[PDB]
Design an enzyme around this catalytic site. Structure first.
Site, PDB file in Angstrom:
ATOM      1  N   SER A   1       1.512   6.640   1.009  1.00 41.05           N
ATOM      2  CA  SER A   1       0.638   5.437   1.472  1.00 41.05           C
ATOM      3  C   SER A   1      -0.452   5.583   1.796  1.00 41.05           C
ATOM      4  O   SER A   1      -1.419   6.306   1.565  1.00 41.05           O
ATOM      5  CB  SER A   1       0.973   5.938   3.157  1.00 41.05           C
ATOM      6  OG  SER A   1       0.199   4.804   3.908  1.00 41.05           O
ATOM      7  N   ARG A   2      -0.938   4.055   0.542  1.00 42.89           N
ATOM      8  CA  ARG A   2      -2.324   4.566  -0.019  1.00 42.89           C
ATOM      9  C   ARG A   2      -3.584   4.551   0.908  1.00 42.89           C
ATOM     10  O   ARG A   2      -4.582   5.160   0.064  1.00 42.89           O
ATOM     11  CB  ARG A   2      -2.457   3.339  -1.338  1.00 42.89           C
ATOM     12  CG  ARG A   2      -1.136   2.990  -1.951  1.00 42.89           C
ATOM     13  CD  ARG A   2      -1.322   1.799  -2.510  1.00 42.89           C
ATOM     14  NE  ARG A   2      -2.830   1.025  -3.377  1.00 42.89           N
ATOM     15  CZ  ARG A   2      -2.608   0.959  -4.879  1.00 42.89           C
ATOM     16  NH1 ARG A   2      -1.282   1.266  -5.110  1.00 42.89           N
ATOM     17  NH2 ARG A   2      -4.002   1.102  -5.543  1.00 42.89           N
ATOM     18  N   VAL A   3      -2.782   4.032   2.046  1.00 43.95           N
ATOM     19  CA  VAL A   3      -4.601   4.323   2.736  1.00 43.95           C
ATOM     20  C   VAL A   3      -4.302   5.630   3.142  1.00 43.95           C
ATOM     21  O   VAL A   3      -4.964   6.558   3.392  1.00 43.95           O
ATOM     22  CB  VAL A   3      -3.138   3.520   4.475  1.00 43.95           C
ATOM     23  CG1 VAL A   3      -4.858   4.114   5.750  1.00 43.95           C
ATOM     24  CG2 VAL A   3      -3.634   2.079   3.365  1.00 43.95           C
ATOM     25  N   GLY A   4      -3.035   6.899   3.652  1.00 45.66           N
ATOM     26  CA  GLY A   4      -2.437   7.502   3.591  1.00 45.66           C
ATOM     27  C   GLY A   4      -3.241   8.709   5.010  1.00 45.66           C
ATOM     28  O   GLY A   4      -3.479   8.034   6.475  1.00 45.66           O
TER      29      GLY A   4
ATOM     30  N   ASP B   1       1.200  -1.111  -0.192  1.00 46.69           N
ATOM     31  CA  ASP B   1       0.133  -0.067  -0.085  1.00 46.69           C
ATOM     32  C   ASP B   1       0.801   1.206   0.140  1.00 46.69           C
ATOM     33  O   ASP B   1       0.365   1.910  -0.056  1.00 46.69           O
ATOM     34  CB  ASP B   1      -1.337  -0.233   1.653  1.00 46.69           C
ATOM     35  CG  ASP B   1      -1.546  -1.166   1.500  1.00 46.69           C
ATOM     36  OD1 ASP B   1      -1.871  -1.599   0.866  1.00 46.69           O
ATOM     37  OD2 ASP B   1      -1.413  -1.597   3.015  1.00 46.69           O
TER      38      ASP B   1
END
Ligand code: ANP
Ligand code: ANP
Ligand code: ANP
Ligand code: MG
Ligand code: MG
Ligand code: MG
Lengths: 482, 470, 484
Positions: free
Chosen positions: A349-352, A324
């Site tokens: 960070s794709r979650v972020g 991610d």
């Protein structure tokens, strides 16, 4: 007999070919006359292809081999905390037998589409740059990546060292247990990594699965799955672990050794077709489980070692496309003195957003903005610049300076947010660039004595009141004036 | 006498297959012997091919071998003599002397393959070993008990460097030392043996402080592939049984990996990437992990690492990095400037550069020197394109200081007098840090660039400055 | 009796598989009933694998094959001098039977750690650039590497030609016998070459060993080894030979060919796994023996051909790290007029000054480093921003130094011709002279020095070391002449 036992036909290069063992399961652990163990990977018409866990000097042609009727498993459970094991769960630290809450197979299905929730709790690493700009969530898979000697382990180790804040406390849902999977490292390194967590009282909540430079390839292949199942124990039991794979590069190299020797057919760089499938299986096991599942979680810090920075390199490609996001390191930034040497422009960070102490995310939505524009007017650092692009260079240098951070000293959130506040809202532009060092130290100790109450609210409320913003503002303008 | 006999069934280059009677095979890593017209021919069992046949590797040339020829099982791995009896002697891969001074009269021999010390036998210490060499001791300081690799493409100065080390370290060292020549130039070895005598380190009619183990490139892969372990075992013995300080010199450790490479396919293994053997990682691991400080005693090793094609990301060197406490990276770019040793000041690293080990001041000087040069490196674009003219004043000074610094990092080695005609200068670690400190704060901005080049301590900078201005 | 004989099983592509030959040695020679010879390389369980020295049209299945009982070996001794022999040392010139003092094997252990000495004698090439920048020593191995058509052979040749200076003398220990190995060259090209050797009365002290383009892969692969032995005779017997391997890239091409056809599994770029071992063991055979062993030397100039300037390709890399330094020739340099197109930047001799003549050493102090600094300032010149009196200064000298090292093919120079040239350049007596005219300076200078101050030229030669007064006479002598 030949259903439970076999005869070595031939042996060499860590591989032994064996006749019989006809009832054997794929990936069954077996045992040789000499006592070395091995696992059966190729089940062929006439013979079984077993990989060795120890020196094949121990094995001879004609020797007897015994089924153990056992798919590789591992002891799991909290009796493992503070322990240093090899990849099969054996104790390597002179501390007696592991007290296992049970055993789990090295291989296990990842939690499916259904029993997961969206990542929403922070892993606070203590690292200003990471926590502020590359926020990690619980259950996430953030990848640490860079060339050799850039700082990759340091990033992970500071995450581990920073958990004392909660692990020493009471509240379960807020603690985080550490699992450091050492792959093909010099034992003296591991020894020292141990001697480093014990020096920070971090061992008590950490587990080291050790598959050092000199051990049979199968063990180096197995260790991360082995340790994966150790983590899931916590995940499955309503708790939270985080797991550092140091490193996946070397695991792939190991898998390669096995395959080639078993004469499985090679592709790009001589890896087998299922080298992807190797790593997908591993990292898909990391997750944030749904309320029905105890809402436990497993977070993943795989380490990947680029070579001269090559993200297209076969392994880095696979892994980058599984994770991610990445924390990206560069020796260039490192020799400049920017440590952690985080390339911000390359780290995502794709979650972020979703995983950030709301308070840190409050005073930093501007931070990625400023440092973006500072990367674009950077080459203007060489005589006749207009006040706008002059200013942009004024924040940037200070801001970059603010995200340097000596090793082993991770910062508490309530200790980050003031510094990132004074930064972003322009209270450092006055200060010279060399004094930003002593600034942080003196600000925080002053804030501690004269404003411990605001700090306390941040640490407790986790958000910033309209009042708290004027509180901090006032306390800053007071310190900056002084 | 209870001797086991086999017969040669194939020869293919360096690979010799042998066949024995029913289930009575020598185990893998055992030595075999063939009695030939001139001396003997040692083999080493590599696989059990089955049907009572083993694949061996030859510790020598395989020409003249006849199929069906008797083979003899020694019963165990290749043996070397060990202890103080190897001091002052030259040894070949198979623990035989090559100095023609008669037989190595030791009480014990030892198998050259052995197991690497358990996790629990390890000993971590942040102790510092002063080299005398300005750039190492300032920027990437070598650790006593440590492991220390010297990376370098061909002819950038590895062998010279390592000899400068021996020149200094190996006198001041109270204990014993082994040197291993793994696939280098027979003549380099020649020099060493004649230097050892004249440095006094060796004494053929008295006491000697060093053992010599040679397996140069004039020798077939099997031999070049094991002589590291031959040497390494002699060290091990002083470590563990003389319970004392050793210095293990390997030049060049890349040839252990290469030799592994040269027989891999003949043993029937599919090539891995860049045509290296599938076992690169674990094979290097299985050796390197024995070269190690443990509770019984301490080894300190200096291994030259050949970096093929100047490519550092070549699977071979790329693997070796993980094994060393301190990495000295020699660079062609550096050496081409006449800057010897060819050390890359940025890419060189040593774990000991940490305030906790060397103090803050040392760490700060060392960091600033690095920042300086890093900036100077970053600005070389703007210097080429827009000259030195188009620069900030701080920058102009940073560059002025970086250039002065580049030079102060070079230094005449004693060993390399044949090249500089300049006398060897050795610098004390405190003198290093002080002079760089001074340089850094500008307390030397007036002195011309040339005054820092190929001299010792700041004394010599002043001395030269005046001698030239005269 | 299948101990001493075998029948052929299959034959194709220089290879013959053979049932029998039970007592045969690895690497042993065998005669086929048809006449053609071969070598046993794969003694497998059922059968033997043989590379042929000939064509194979003449070998059929079932044809009887015969043990020689010998490993491949060559005639040696000074009888070879002047002769053109094939890989096995058969006359191919037309001059009749070789007389040999004996026979060596093709593969021989290199002299150990033990019986050697430091390289201290020069092997004077008479090539200004080489003898001042990369001085070669009696005993050292020195790579000549560059692309195709760059002048690799030319460097080697000009070296051989030079030895006339000493070989027509009577002091055996100053002499240097040459061995030139032709590997993969076309025949006429070996011809064109022995002609030139003779045109220069240079053939009386050389031995060409030829494994031309058309010969069997085994002969090509073997030649350098056989040759190494021919000149090992000289080294062992108190004399000094010079071996030129022209060129190893082809030997490896051929050694690749034996192996792929013998079916040994391949290494990188289809080469065999130990293609390195191949060269390493040859090149180590060059050495400078100790007094106890007769002080004989053998000196090696291998050649290697690259592609597209890439030195990072397999074989060059191998040899580059095997030898005691390289001379890089470059096409770009060539076409802009530096000939020899030596690349100072990249060329080294690792022996260094140890093998330079003292006089040459004395006046060549720092030249090679300076020439580097020169490329430095000339790269900064491309900015075409105004120069100061320091940079213009070193530019003027570097340009003239560059020009002073240019040299015509076939004209090696005596040391005492070289020395004053170098001295005139270094101490900057050339620096006020037109660049196109430095050509005429050279010969006009030498002409005058012979004419007048011959007494110096003969001292330099006899003494090899410029004493303080000799520096004086020379100093005076140069100034004198520069004022025309
Ligand atoms: N923030 C920091 N401040 C100061 N020093 C640091 C920092 N981070 C790392 N270092 C140092 O820099 C070196 C590199 O860090 P390290 O954790 O070894 O990166 P790495 O990717 O794990 N290197 P390796 O895995 O051994 O190839 C170490 O020697 C540390 O002492
Ligand atoms: N000093 C020189 N001056 C003028 N021409 C030269 C010089 N040296 C070599 N050459 C010429 O350049 C041509 C090729 O040179 P050569 O000595 O064969 O280089 P090479 O690398 O051996 N070429 P090849 O081996 O056939 O690929 C010859 O015609 C020579 O005349
Ligand atoms: N300190 C030094 N001063 C001057 N010249 C040096 C120095 N170190 C190396 N050199 C030069 O570089 C050459 C090669 O030195 P050497 O130590 O043999 O390189 P190397 O990298 O060990 N060769 P190899 O073992 O094949 O990789 C020498 O012949 C010296 O001219
Ligand atoms: Mg690390
Ligand atoms: Mg060397
Ligand atoms: Mg040619």
């Amino acid at each position: 007999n030949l259903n439970e036992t076999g005869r070595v036909l031939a042996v060499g290069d860590g591989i032994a070919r064996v006749f019989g063992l006809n009832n054997i399961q794929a990936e069954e652990l077996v045992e040789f006359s000499s006592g070395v163990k091995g696992m059966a990977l190729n089940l062929e018409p006439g013979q079984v292809g077993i990989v060795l866990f120890g020196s094949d000097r121990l094995v001879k042609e004609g020797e007897l081999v015994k089924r153990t009727g056992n798919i590789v498993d591992v002891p799991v459970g909290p009796g493992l905390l503070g322990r240093v094991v090899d990849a099969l769960g054996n104790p390597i630290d002179g501390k007696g037998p592991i007290d296992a809450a049970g055993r789990s197979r090295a291989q296990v299905k990842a939690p499916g589409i259904l029993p997961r929730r969206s990542v929403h709790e922070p892993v606070q690493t203590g690292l200003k740059a990471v926590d502020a700009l590359v926020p990690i969530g619980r259950g996430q898979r953030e990848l640490i990546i860079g060339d050799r000697q850039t700082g990759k382990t340091a990033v992970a180790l500071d995450t581990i060292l920073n958990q004392k804040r909660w692990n020493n406390g009471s509240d379960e849902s807020k603690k985080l247990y550490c699992v450091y999977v050492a792959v093909g490292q010099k034992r003296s390194t591991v020894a020292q990594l141990v001697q480093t967590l014990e020096q920070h009282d971090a061992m008590k909540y950490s587990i080291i699965v050790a598959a050092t430079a000199s051990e049979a390839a199968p063990l180096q292949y197995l260790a991360p799955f082995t340790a994966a199942s150790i983590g899931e124990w916590f995940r499955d039991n309503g708790k939270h672990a985080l797991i550092v794979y140091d490193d996946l590069s070397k695991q792939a190299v190991a898998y390669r050794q096995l395959s080639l020797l078993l004469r499985r057919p090679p592709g790009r760089e001589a890896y087998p077709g299922d080298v992807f499938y190797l790593h997908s299986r591993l990292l898909e096991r990391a997750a944030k489980l749904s309320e029905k599942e105890g809402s436990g979680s497993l977070t993943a810090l795989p380490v990947i070692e680029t070579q001269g920075g090559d993200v297209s390199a076969y392994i880095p490609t696979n892994v980058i496309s599984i994770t991610d996001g990445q924390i990206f390191l560069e020796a260039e930034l490192f020799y400049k003195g920017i440590r952690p040497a985080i390339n911000v422009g390359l780290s995502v960070s794709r979650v972020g957003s979703a995983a950030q102490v709301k308070a840190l995310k409050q005073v930093a939505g501007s931070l990625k903005l400023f440092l973006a524009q500072y990367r674009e007017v950077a080459a203007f650092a060489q005589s006749d610049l207009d006040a706008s692009t002059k200013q942009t260079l004024v924040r940037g240098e200070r801001l970059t300076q603010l995200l340097k951070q000596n090793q082993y000293s991770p910062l508490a959130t309530e200790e980050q947010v003031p510094l990132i506040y004074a930064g972003v809202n322009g209270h450092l532009d006055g200060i010279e660039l060399s004094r930003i060092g002593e600034f942080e130290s003196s600000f925080l100790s002053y804030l501690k004595s004269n404003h411990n109450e605001l700090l306390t609210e941040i640490r407790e409320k986790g958000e910033l009141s309209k009042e708290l913003l004027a509180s901090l503002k006032s306390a800053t303008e007071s310190f900056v004036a002084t | 006498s209870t001797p086991i006999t086999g017969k040669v069934t194939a020869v293919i280059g360096a690979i010799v297959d042998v066949h024995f009677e029913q289930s009575e095979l020598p185990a893998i890593l055992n030595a075999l012997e063939i009695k030939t017209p001139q001396g003997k021919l040692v083999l080493e069992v590599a696989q059990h091919l089955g049907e009572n046949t083993v694949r061996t590797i030859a510790m020598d040339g395989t020409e003249g071998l006849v199929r069906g020829e008797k083979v003899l099982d020694t019963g165990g791995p290749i043996s070397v003599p060990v202890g103080r009896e190897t001091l002052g002697r030259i040894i070949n891969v198979i623990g035989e002397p090559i100095d023609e001074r008669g037989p190595i009269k030791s009480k014990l021999r030892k198998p050259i393959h052995a197991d690497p010390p358990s996790f629990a036998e390890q000993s971590t210490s942040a102790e510092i070993l002063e080299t005398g060499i300005k750039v190492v001791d300032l920027l990437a300081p070598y650790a006593r008990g440590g492991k220390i690799g010297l990376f370098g493409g061909a002819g950038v100065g590895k062998t010279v460097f390592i000899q400068e080390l021996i020149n200094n370290i190996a006198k001041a060292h109270g204990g014993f030392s082994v040197f291993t020549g793994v696939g280098e130039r027979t003549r380099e070895g020649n020099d060493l043996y004649r230097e050892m005598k004249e440095t006094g380190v060796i004494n053929l009619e008295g006491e000697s402080k060093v053992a010599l183990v040679f397996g140069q490139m004039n020798e077939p892969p099997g031999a070049r592939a094991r002589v590291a372990l031959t040497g390494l075992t002699i060290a091990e013995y002083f470590r563990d049984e003389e319970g004392q300080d050793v210095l293990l010199f390997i030049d060049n450790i890349f040839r252990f990996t290469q030799a592994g490479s040269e027989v891999s396919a003949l043993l029937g293994r599919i090539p891995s990437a860049v045509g290296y053997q599938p076992t690169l990682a674990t094979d290097m691991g299985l050796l390197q992990e024995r070269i190690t400080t443990t509770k019984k005693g301490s080894v300190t090793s200096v291994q030259a690492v050949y970096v093929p094609a100047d490519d550092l990301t070549d699977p071979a060197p790329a693997t070796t990095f993980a094994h060393l406490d301190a990495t000295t990276v020699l660079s062609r770019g550096i050496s081409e400037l006449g800057i010897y040793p060819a050390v890359d000041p940025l890419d060189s690293k040593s774990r000991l550069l940490d305030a906790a080990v060397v103090g803050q001041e040392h760490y700060d000087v060392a960091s600033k020197v690095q920042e300086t040069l890093q900036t100077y490196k970053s600005l070389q674009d703007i210097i080429a394109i827009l000259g030195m003219d188009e620069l900030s004043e701080q920058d102009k000074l940073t560059v002025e200081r970086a250039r002065k610094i580049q030079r102060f990092l070079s230094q005449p080695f004693a060993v390399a007098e044949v090249f500089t005609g300049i006398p060897g200068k050795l610098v004390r670690l405190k003198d290093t840090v002080a002079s760089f400190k001074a340089v850094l704060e500008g307390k030397y901005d007036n002195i011309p660039e040339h005054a820092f080049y190929m001299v010792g301590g700041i004394e010599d900078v002043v001395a030269k400055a005046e001698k030239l201005a005269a």
